[PDB]
């Protein structure tokens, strides 16, 4: 949890729909955004911390 990877994404087209295809019992809580309006705002860099 202290040594987390930080992936840097580049110019591409992200499909935020495969996130809910895995096994059930998973949370999708957002902060400041919404899943239905996620594909409306334009972002420069998205960083994933696992």
């Amino acid at each position, epitope marked *: 949890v202290y040594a*987390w*990877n930080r992936k840097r994404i580049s110019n591409c087209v992200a499909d935020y729909s495969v996130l809910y295809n895995l096994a059930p019992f998973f949370t999708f809580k957002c902060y400041g955004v919404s899943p239905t309006k996620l594909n409306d705002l334009c972002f420069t860099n998205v960083y994933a911390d696992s």
Partner: antibody, heavy 126, light 108 residues
């Protein structure tokens, strides 16, 4: 091409701690796995630990659990290994090996070394 | 896991040698091989018994049959004397099980 510079090693008292480092040069430090594997003088080799392309531990041996801690740094492109509670049976040449495959998402767990280094003599005695 | 390797195998530089690595039920998992020269750095040889890295000639080959992985070296010379190691994955324990390498020495 590939220059895996290994640093850290010397004479330390039994029970102390140290930090070994392996820096890559030549390839991208985001799509290759790197492992630490010791080699006793004239007594074969012994795998210590390893980390995949991302920040992920793969496991350890049956005699190094709880004492060693491996970490990865993609910002500085370096694999670090912290060793604690060293004993007399930890004197070997710790080699920093790379991986050949790109370690795609969906595959089978099969990691094998492709490039080797020089190793650092880390002796533990009084 | 635990691999069993011959302590030392010597052969004249006229025929091929027999470097075998066997286990208990190793029939489908991948088997890799490495060649470390004494004093220098190890190098990769024919792995998975179905392909070879870039630079390794056709002299090296690997063959798995049931419970024995054999590393066949063709036309062994004086400059081929090194320590051959065989590596397996053994996903049951999440480790990398090595073994005592064989010191191939060209006799004669």
């Amino acid at each position: 091409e590939v220059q895996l510079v290994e640093s850290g090693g010397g004479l330390v008292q039994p029970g102390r701690s140290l930090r070994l480092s392996c820096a890559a040069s030549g390839f991208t430090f985001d799509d290759y796995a790197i492992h630490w594997v010791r080699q006793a003088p004239g007594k074969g080799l012994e795998w210590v630990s390893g980390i995949t392309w991302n920040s992920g531990t793969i496991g350890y041996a049956d005699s190094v659990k709880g004492r060693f801690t491996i970490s990865r740094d993609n910002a500085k492109n370096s694999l670090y290994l912290q060793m604690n509670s060293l004993r007399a049976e930890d004197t070997a040449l710790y080699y920093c090996a790379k991986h050949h495959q790109i370690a795609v998402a969906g595959d089978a767990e099969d990691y094998y070394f492709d490039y080797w280094g020089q190793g650092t003599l880390v002796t533990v005695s009084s | 896991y635990e691999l069993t390797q011959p302590p030392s195998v010597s052969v004249a530089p006229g025929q091929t040698a027999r470097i075998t690595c066997g286990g208990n039920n190793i029939g489908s998992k991948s088997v890799h091989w490495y060649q470390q020269k004494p004093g220098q750095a190890p190098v990769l040889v024919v792995y998975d018994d179905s392909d070879r890295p870039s630079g390794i000639p056709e002299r090296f080959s690997g063959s798995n049959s049931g419970n024995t992985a054999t590393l066949t070296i063709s036309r062994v010379e004086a400059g081929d004397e090194a320590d051959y190691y065989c590596q397996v994955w053994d996903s049951r324990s999440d480790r990398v099980v090595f073994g005592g390498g064989t010191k191939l020495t060209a006799l004669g």
